[PDB]
Amino acid sequence: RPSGTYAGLPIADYGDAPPLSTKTMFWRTSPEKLPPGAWEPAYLGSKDERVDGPSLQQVMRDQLKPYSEPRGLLPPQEILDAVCDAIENRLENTLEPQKPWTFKKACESLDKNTSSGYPYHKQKSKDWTGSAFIGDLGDQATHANNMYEMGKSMRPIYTAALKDELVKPDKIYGKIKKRLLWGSDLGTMIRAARAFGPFCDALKETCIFNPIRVGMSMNEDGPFIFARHANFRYHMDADYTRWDSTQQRAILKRAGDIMVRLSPEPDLARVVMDDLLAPSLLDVGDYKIVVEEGLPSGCPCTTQLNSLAHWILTLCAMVEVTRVDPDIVMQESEFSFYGDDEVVSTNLELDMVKYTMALRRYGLLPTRADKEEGPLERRQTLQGISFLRRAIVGDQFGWYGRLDRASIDRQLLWTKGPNHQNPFETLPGHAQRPSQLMALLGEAAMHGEKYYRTVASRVSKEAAQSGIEMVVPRHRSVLRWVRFGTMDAETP
Amino acid sequence: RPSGTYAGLPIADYGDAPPLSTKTMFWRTSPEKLPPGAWEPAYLGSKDERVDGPSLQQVMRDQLKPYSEPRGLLPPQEILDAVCDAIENRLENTLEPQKPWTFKKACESLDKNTSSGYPYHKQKSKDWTGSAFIGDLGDQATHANNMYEMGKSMRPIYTAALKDELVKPDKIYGKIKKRLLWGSDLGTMIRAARAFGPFCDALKETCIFNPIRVGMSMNEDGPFIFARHANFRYHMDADYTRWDSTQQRAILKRAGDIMVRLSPEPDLARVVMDDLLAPSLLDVGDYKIVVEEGLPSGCPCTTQLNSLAHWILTLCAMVEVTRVDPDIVMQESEFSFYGDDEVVSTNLELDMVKYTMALRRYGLLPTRADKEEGPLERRQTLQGISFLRRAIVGDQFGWYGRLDRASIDRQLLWTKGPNHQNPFETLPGHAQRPSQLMALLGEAAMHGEKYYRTVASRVSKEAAQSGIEMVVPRHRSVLRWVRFGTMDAETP
Ligand SMILES: [Mn+3]
Ligand SMILES: [Mn+3]
C-alpha cells in the first residue's frame, strides 16, 4: 500500500462497500403518460428499463474525475489572512459560547434513518435503543468516543453513493449523470458531532444575523433574511458548477481553523478536524481510493465547514477586486451561504469582470444565467434570484421565498415511497400525503387565483383516489396562512 | 341638563371623581444633589415643596383647552374613502379571522392594578377572585356584559387624571405642565374588550407585517421592523404636538368603522364603538363635562383606534400630495404607528412643503426637529430617527432600537416605589431592582466600552448599597446578549 489506480486516483485498499443502489424512492402519482420534457428519477443502472446506459460503477467513475483535476490558486496570503481574521472576529462577536457535547448528545443528534457506513453499512436505528447504541454500532461508537476523549487520531472511511433524485430528462436519455455522495462512517460521525455540535448550534441560533443560513426556516426566516439583503444596492448569484469537487483543502483548513478555535474543546476538536481534512479514503466498492483534494462532504458538520469556506472565498474575491478591507465589505454587504448556494448583496461598486476572473483563478466555476461565456452579471433588484431552491419574491407585505410552478408540478407528479425498480409504477397504497398536499396548496396560493385553482383540482383528485378526505380551503385563506400564518402547524 | 361651563366646555352633571393625586411613584436612588437641568417627577400641586404653583385643578384646566379649539378640515372625501378602503383591504388580506371573546376572557384581559373608574374608583384587583369579578365590580361587569349581549347602548363615563412621570425641569419651575389621562369606566372596559379584543389580537400577531406596532418587542421585533423601513429611500417623523386633543371624531369614526367591520361580532361591536365615539362625559372632580371632539383615550383598545386614525391621516396627506393611489403608496412605503408615534419611509418623491400644509390643514400640529417654523424635513438615512422612545441604530449586524445616554442616566437617578409626597426622599428599602439593572446594563453596552464601564460602576454601587449581589459581566458578553441573545430571559 498504496499502489494502483482507479478512476484516476490512487488505490489504498480493497473495498467493503455494498453494491450501488439500483432502485428509486419516487413513484408516479398516476398511470397517465408523463408530460414531454418532464423530470424523472435519476438513472438506475443496467436494470433500468428506460435506457441502455453504462454501469452505475462507470457513472461513478465519471463523477470522480474533477478530484484529480489540478487545483486552482490560493487567494493572496495577506487577503486570505485578513478575511479569515474578520470572519473569526464576526463570529466571536455574535456566537453564544456553548458547553461541550456529551457522548449521549452526539449520539442523539445523528440521523438514525441513514447508514452507519463503514464497516457495518447498517441503518443506524437497527442498533439504537432510543437513547444509546448497542451491538456492533455500540462497539464502534464507544471506541470512537474513547479515541475522542484521549485526543487520539482515527482515519475516516467514506462510502460512495449516487443520489436518488429527480433530474432533467437529458441526464437520463442523453449524457447520463448522477450525483456523488459521501457516506461518512459512524466513528467519524460521533467524533465530528461531539467536537463541532456546539459550534453548529451556536451558528444555527445566529442564522439570521450571520451569512451561514443552515437551520433557517424559509417561511419563518426568509422574510427577514431577504429584507436584510434588500437593504443593499447590488445583488448576484455566481451559480457554481461542481462546487464540492473544486475545493482546496488549504481553504477548507482555514475554515476548519475557525471552527476549532470557536469550539468549547479546541484541543480535542483539532484532532478531529485534522482527521477530516487529511487525504480521504473513499470506498467505491472494489477499492478504497485516496482523495487528496475537494470537499469530504460526509459528516454532520460538513455543510457548515463548506459554507465557511464559501464565505472565505467570496470575501477574498471581493476584497481582492474592490480593495476594501474584509470587515468594511461586511458592513457594506449581506451574504447568504448554504454549502455551494449563495446570494451576495452589496453597496460596493464591484467590477464583475475582475470578480469573475478572481473566482476562476481560485479554481471555481461560476456560471452566467444564460450559460454563455463572459462575466457574471449583477442586478439592482433581488426579484429573480433564488436561494434554497425557492425564488425570492417581494410585494407590499414584504419579501419571501416561493417555489416555482415547475417544482410544484413536479411534486404533484411524483411521491416518495419504499425503494423499487420501476419509477413509472403507481404506489398502490391509496397514498396519504396530507401534510405535503397542504404545503403544496400553500406554495400554489402564492402564485395567484388562476394557478391555485388548477393545483387545487389536482390536489383534490389525488386526495379523492386516496384514503383521507380533507377540506380544500379558499385561495385567500391559504394565502394568508402561508405568508403570515400565526404559526406553521395545521391548516388555515 | 346640560347647562354651565367648566374649562371652556359644557357641564353635564356633578362630579364623582376622587381628588387628583398629590403624590409620585419616583424615588431618588441617592441623597446626592441632582445634576443641573435634570428631569424630575411632574408637579404635585399645592403641597409640592419644590415650587409654589397653581392647583392641580387649574393645571388640568390648562390641559382641557385644546378640546374647545376649532377642529381642522376633513381630508377630501374621495381620498378619505380611497385610503379607508385600501387600509381595510390590507387588513382583510393579513388578519387571521378570530373567534368572539367570552365575558370571562374580556375580564381576564383587563389590567387589575389600575382603577375601575366610575362609579367605584377602586383598584380592579380588590374585587377580583382570580377568574371573575365579585362584589361591586361584579355587579358593574355583569350588567355591562348583559347590555353588550343585548346590543344595548351605555353612556361611557371617563375620569380625568394627570400623569406621574419624569419631565424636563422647565415644566416644573417655568410654565407648569402635566399630561391629561382619561380613565375609562369598568363597564365600558368590559364592553370594549369583548367587542374589540379579537381585532386587537389579530393585529398584534401581525405587528411586523402591518404598520400598527402595538404589541411589538423592541429587542425581538425592532431589528426586522427597522430593516423593512431601511428598504425605502426617504425617512421622516412628523413629531406631533397634542395629537390626541387635535383628533376629529369623524376621522375616528372611519377608524372605528374598520375595527367594527373586521370584528367577529360586527353588530354588537357597532353599539360599543358608537358609544365610544359619541360626545364623551369626562369627570374632572366637581363636574362631568361634555367633550365632543378629540380622542377619548380611556380604553383597552384605544391605542389601536388611534394608530388606525393616524394611518388614515398619513395616507390621506401622502395621497393628496403625491397623487398616487393609497394602495400603491403602501407598496412604495413602510409605516410604523403607535398612537401618535410614527416613522414613515417611502420611495415616493414627496413635496415636504405641500405635505406639511396638508397635515396642518387637517388640524394636526407636526413639528420640525429644530422646533422652528417651516416644512417637515426628510432624510435618506434612518439613523437619527426614534420610535417607542428608542433611537434607531444600524451597524454591520443589522438595525435595532437603543435607549439614549440621557434616558439611561435618568433610570439610574430614579426608581419606582410606593406613592409619596417628596420626590427627593430615598427609598430606604435597600431597593432591589435586579431585572431592571440588568436591562440597563444591556442598554449601556450598546453604547460602547467607555460608556458601559461608567454605567457598570453606578450599577454596582446601586447593587452594593442594596440587598442582593449579582455578577457584573464583561462588556462583550452583555452586548452579545442584548443584540443577539438566544432569548431575553436571565443574564448572559
Ligand atoms: Mn443558488
Ligand atoms: Mn416619535
Side-chain angles (χ1 to χ4, degrees):
Chain A
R1 22 289 295 93
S3 263
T5 305
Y6 183 88
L9 300 160
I11 289 159
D13 207 352
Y14 308 144
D16 288 303
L20 293 173
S21 169
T22 238
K23 297 171 169 179
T24 181
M25 71 183 81
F26 299 91
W27 300 63
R28 280 246 50 217
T29 52
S30 297
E32 312 154 59
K33 203 220 286 177
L34 214 45
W39 287 33
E40 291 181 23
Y43 176 62
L44 301 182
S46 281
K47 302 186 171 191
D48 201 330
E49 20 201 312
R50 299 174 289 169
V51 268
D52 282 328
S55 64
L56 292 165
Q57 223 65 239
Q58 180 64 81
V59 170
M60 167 151 299
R61 286 184 218 109
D62 291 338
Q63 285 294 118
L64 289 170
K65 285 181 200 185
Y67 294 95
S68 64
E69 210 53 55
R71 226 89 307 242
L73 298 182
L74 210 59
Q77 191 68 58
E78 330 66 40
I79 288 163
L80 182 61
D81 291 336
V83 341
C84 291
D85 279 344
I87 290 168
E88 177 174 297
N89 190 68
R90 185 193 180 93
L91 261 23
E92 264 150 40
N93 288 341
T94 46
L95 305 185
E96 200 49 54
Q98 304 291 111
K99 60 170 185 162
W101 269 27
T102 53
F103 172 61
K104 176 152 199 165
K105 200 187 189 103
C107 285
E108 279 158 358
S109 81
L110 306 179
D111 181 342
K112 304 308 188 307
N113 291 128
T114 54
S115 185
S116 69
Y118 184 87
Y120 299 112
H121 312 280
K122 145 204 303 194
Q123 210 191 32
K124 270 167 273 178
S125 53
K126 178 284 181 185
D127 275 331
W128 180 249
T129 66
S131 73
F133 287 113
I134 44 109
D136 296 324
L137 268 33
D139 290 339
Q140 176 164 214
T142 301
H143 174 58
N145 187 243
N146 284 140
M147 293 299 276
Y148 175 80
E149 287 172 357
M150 294 196 284
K152 287 194 179 162
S153 155
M154 292 188 78
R155 226 276 177 65
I157 295 184
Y158 303 84
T159 297
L162 301 174
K163 200 185 194 292
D164 178 24
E165 66 187 337
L166 303 179
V167 291
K168 74 171 187 179
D170 188 67
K171 296 173 166 164
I172 304 151
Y173 303 98
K175 170 66 180 170
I176 296 176
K177 276 170 182 173
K178 205 170 175 188
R179 304 211 272 88
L180 178 66
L181 290 177
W182 290 59
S184 182
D185 77 79
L186 181 62
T188 302
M189 290 168 189
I190 272 137
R191 290 201 303 133
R194 270 199 93 172
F196 302 111
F199 177 83
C200 298
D201 275 355
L203 207 52
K204 277 166 224 122
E205 278 167 1
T206 239
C207 73
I208 292 169
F209 296 104
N210 282 152
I212 300 169
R213 309 300 193 185
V214 177
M216 71 170 273
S217 167
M218 180 55 74
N219 269 245
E220 273 162 35
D221 303 321
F224 187 8
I225 292 168
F226 304 143
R228 291 178 140 257
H229 275 275
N231 287 340
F232 303 92
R233 182 154 171 188
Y234 306 107
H235 308 279
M236 57 188 179
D237 174 14
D239 195 7
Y240 292 102
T241 291
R242 289 193 287 284
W243 176 266
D244 290 358
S245 59
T246 54
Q247 294 309 294
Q248 303 169 225
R249 290 285 169 106
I251 289 298
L252 295 175
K253 284 149 179 304
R254 299 287 243 117
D257 284 333
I258 296 160
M259 290 183 73
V260 163
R261 210 154 292 125
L262 272 37
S263 297
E265 300 191 289
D267 285 358
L268 302 184
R270 175 91 268 153
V271 175
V272 183
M273 185 58 67
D274 281 353
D275 291 329
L276 293 174
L277 263 27
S280 314
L281 239 25
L282 181 65
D283 196 326
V284 295
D286 292 336
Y287 312 111
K288 294 171 194 132
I289 63 184
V290 178
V291 193
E292 211 140 272
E293 280 294 350
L295 176 75
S297 64
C299 287
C301 296
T302 248
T303 301
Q304 285 85 356
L305 172 73
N306 198 208
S307 297
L308 213 29
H310 196 149
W311 192 351
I312 290 155
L313 292 160
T314 302
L315 257 183
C316 284
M318 290 189 82
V319 169
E320 195 178 323
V321 173
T322 59
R323 308 296 325 271
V324 4
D325 295 357
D327 61 323
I328 301 310
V329 173
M330 227 137 43
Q331 72 186 58
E332 292 296 335
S333 311
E334 185 73 17
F335 306 133
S336 289
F337 308 116
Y338 196 122
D340 68 330
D341 203 355
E342 70 159 46
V343 182
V344 175
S345 297
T346 190
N347 290 326
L348 291 184
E349 215 55 67
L350 182 66
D351 179 342
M352 296 300 290
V353 183
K354 286 193 196 289
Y355 174 71
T356 309
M357 281 173 69
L359 293 170
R360 273 167 189 164
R361 204 205 317 120
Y362 304 156
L364 309 167
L365 307 168
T367 94
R368 300 177 41 105
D370 62 27
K371 277 96 169 198
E372 258 140 69
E373 197 178 338
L376 267 4
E377 215 113 57
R378 66 176 189 173
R379 223 296 145 275
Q380 296 192 52
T381 183
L382 203 46
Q383 214 108 213
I385 285 168
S386 272
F387 190 69
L388 288 191
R389 278 138 38 246
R390 313 268 128 76
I392 301 158
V393 180
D395 55 27
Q396 71 267 192
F397 308 110
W399 296 92
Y400 65 107
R402 185 179 69 189
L403 197 61
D404 63 271
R405 297 187 194 221
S407 315
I408 293 168
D409 300 339
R410 258 183 268 122
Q411 284 175 228
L412 284 160
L413 297 167
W414 302 92
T415 185
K416 296 182 152 80
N419 290 338
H420 71 141
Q421 196 62 253
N422 174 32
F424 300 130
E425 282 174 45
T426 269
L427 187 70
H430 257 48
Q432 312 77 61
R433 17 152 44 177
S435 211
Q436 161 137 23
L437 257 28
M438 192 63 229
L440 228 32
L441 248 26
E443 300 288 347
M446 294 183 279
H447 279 277
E449 223 282 336
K450 189 177 171 142
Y451 185 76
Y452 172 83
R453 203 156 67 102
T454 78
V455 169
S457 307
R458 296 169 69 176
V459 168
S460 266
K461 295 178 172 206
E462 195 157 314
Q465 54 181 308
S466 185
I468 208 79
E469 268 307 296
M470 193 168 60
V471 214
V472 171
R474 320 95 141 176
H475 166 80
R476 79 98 166 245
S477 297
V478 60
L479 179 62
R480 202 203 301 115
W481 166 87
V482 264
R483 288 294 303 278
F484 322 114
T486 76
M487 227 165 302
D488 265 300
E490 26 98 57
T491 72
Chain B
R1 22 289 295 93
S3 263
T5 305
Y6 183 88
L9 300 160
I11 289 159
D13 207 352
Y14 308 144
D16 288 303
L20 293 173
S21 169
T22 238
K23 297 171 169 179
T24 181
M25 71 183 81
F26 299 91
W27 300 63
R28 280 246 50 217
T29 52
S30 297
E32 312 154 59
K33 203 220 286 177
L34 214 45
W39 287 33
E40 291 181 23
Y43 176 62
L44 301 182
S46 281
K47 302 186 171 191
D48 201 330
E49 20 201 312
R50 299 174 289 169
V51 268
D52 282 328
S55 64
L56 292 165
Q57 223 65 239
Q58 180 64 81
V59 170
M60 167 151 299
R61 286 184 218 109
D62 291 338
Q63 285 294 118
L64 289 170
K65 285 181 200 185
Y67 294 95
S68 64
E69 210 53 55
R71 226 89 307 242
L73 298 182
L74 210 59
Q77 191 68 58
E78 330 66 40
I79 288 163
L80 182 61
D81 291 336
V83 341
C84 291
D85 279 344
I87 290 168
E88 177 174 297
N89 190 68
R90 185 193 180 93
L91 261 23
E92 264 150 40
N93 288 341
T94 46
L95 305 185
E96 200 49 54
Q98 304 291 111
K99 60 170 185 162
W101 269 27
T102 53
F103 172 61
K104 176 152 199 165
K105 200 187 189 103
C107 285
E108 279 158 358
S109 81
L110 306 179
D111 181 342
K112 304 308 188 307
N113 291 128
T114 54
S115 185
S116 69
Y118 184 87
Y120 299 112
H121 312 280
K122 145 204 303 194
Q123 210 191 32
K124 270 167 273 178
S125 53
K126 178 284 181 185
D127 275 331
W128 180 249
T129 66
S131 73
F133 287 113
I134 44 109
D136 296 324
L137 268 33
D139 290 339
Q140 176 164 214
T142 301
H143 174 58
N145 187 243
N146 284 140
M147 293 299 276
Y148 175 80
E149 287 172 357
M150 294 196 284
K152 287 194 179 162
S153 155
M154 292 188 78
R155 226 276 177 65
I157 295 184
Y158 303 84
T159 297
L162 301 174
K163 200 185 194 292
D164 178 24
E165 66 187 337
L166 303 179
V167 291
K168 74 171 187 179
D170 188 67
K171 296 173 166 164
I172 304 151
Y173 303 98
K175 170 66 180 170
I176 296 176
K177 276 170 182 173
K178 205 170 175 188
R179 304 211 272 88
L180 178 66
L181 290 177
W182 290 59
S184 182
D185 77 79
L186 181 62
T188 302
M189 290 168 189
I190 272 137
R191 290 201 303 133
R194 270 199 93 172
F196 302 111
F199 177 83
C200 298
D201 275 355
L203 207 52
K204 277 166 224 122
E205 278 167 1
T206 239
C207 73
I208 292 169
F209 296 104
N210 282 152
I212 300 169
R213 309 300 193 185
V214 177
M216 71 170 273
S217 167
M218 180 55 74
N219 269 245
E220 273 162 35
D221 303 321
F224 187 8
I225 292 168
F226 304 143
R228 291 178 140 257
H229 275 275
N231 287 340
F232 303 92
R233 182 154 171 188
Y234 306 107
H235 308 279
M236 57 188 179
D237 174 14
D239 195 7
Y240 292 102
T241 291
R242 289 193 287 284
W243 176 266
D244 290 358
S245 59
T246 54
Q247 294 309 294
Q248 303 169 225
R249 290 285 169 106
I251 289 298
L252 295 175
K253 284 149 179 304
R254 299 287 243 117
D257 284 333
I258 296 160
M259 290 183 73
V260 163
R261 210 154 292 125
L262 272 37
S263 297
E265 300 191 289
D267 285 358
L268 302 184
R270 175 91 268 153
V271 175
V272 183
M273 185 58 67
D274 281 353
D275 291 329
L276 293 174
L277 263 27
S280 314
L281 239 25
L282 181 65
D283 196 326
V284 295
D286 292 336
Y287 312 111
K288 294 171 194 132
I289 63 184
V290 178
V291 193
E292 211 140 272
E293 280 294 350
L295 176 75
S297 64
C299 287
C301 296
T302 248
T303 301
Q304 285 85 356
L305 172 73
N306 198 208
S307 297
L308 213 29
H310 196 149
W311 192 351
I312 290 155
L313 292 160
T314 302
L315 257 183
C316 284
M318 290 189 82
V319 169
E320 195 178 323
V321 173
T322 59
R323 308 296 325 271
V324 4
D325 295 357
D327 61 323
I328 301 310
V329 173
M330 227 137 43
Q331 72 186 58
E332 292 296 335
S333 311
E334 185 73 17
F335 306 133
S336 289
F337 308 116
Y338 196 122
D340 68 330
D341 203 355
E342 70 159 46
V343 182
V344 175
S345 297
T346 190
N347 290 326
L348 291 184
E349 215 55 67
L350 182 66
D351 179 342
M352 296 300 290
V353 183
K354 286 193 196 289
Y355 174 71
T356 309
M357 281 173 69
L359 293 170
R360 273 167 189 164
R361 204 205 317 120
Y362 304 156
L364 309 167
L365 307 168
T367 94
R368 300 177 41 105
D370 62 27
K371 277 96 169 198
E372 258 140 69
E373 197 178 338
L376 267 4
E377 215 113 57
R378 66 176 189 173
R379 223 296 145 275
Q380 296 192 52
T381 183
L382 203 46
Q383 214 108 213
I385 285 168
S386 272
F387 190 69
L388 288 191
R389 278 138 38 246
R390 313 268 128 76
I392 301 158
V393 180
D395 55 27
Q396 71 267 192
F397 308 110
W399 296 92
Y400 65 107
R402 185 179 69 189
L403 197 61
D404 63 271
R405 297 187 194 221
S407 315
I408 293 168
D409 300 339
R410 258 183 268 122
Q411 284 175 228
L412 284 160
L413 297 167
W414 302 92
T415 185
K416 296 182 152 80
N419 290 338
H420 71 141
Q421 196 62 253
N422 174 32
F424 300 130
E425 282 174 45
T426 269
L427 187 70
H430 257 48
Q432 312 77 61
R433 17 152 44 177
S435 211
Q436 161 137 23
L437 257 28
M438 192 63 229
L440 228 32
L441 248 26
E443 300 288 347
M446 294 183 279
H447 279 277
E449 223 282 336
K450 189 177 171 142
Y451 185 76
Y452 172 83
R453 203 156 67 102
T454 78
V455 169
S457 307
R458 296 169 69 176
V459 168
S460 266
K461 295 178 172 206
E462 195 157 314
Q465 54 181 308
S466 185
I468 208 79
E469 268 307 296
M470 193 168 60
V471 214
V472 171
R474 320 95 141 176
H475 166 80
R476 79 98 166 245
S477 297
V478 60
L479 179 62
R480 202 203 301 115
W481 166 87
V482 264
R483 288 294 303 278
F484 322 114
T486 76
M487 227 165 302
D488 265 300
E490 26 98 57
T491 72

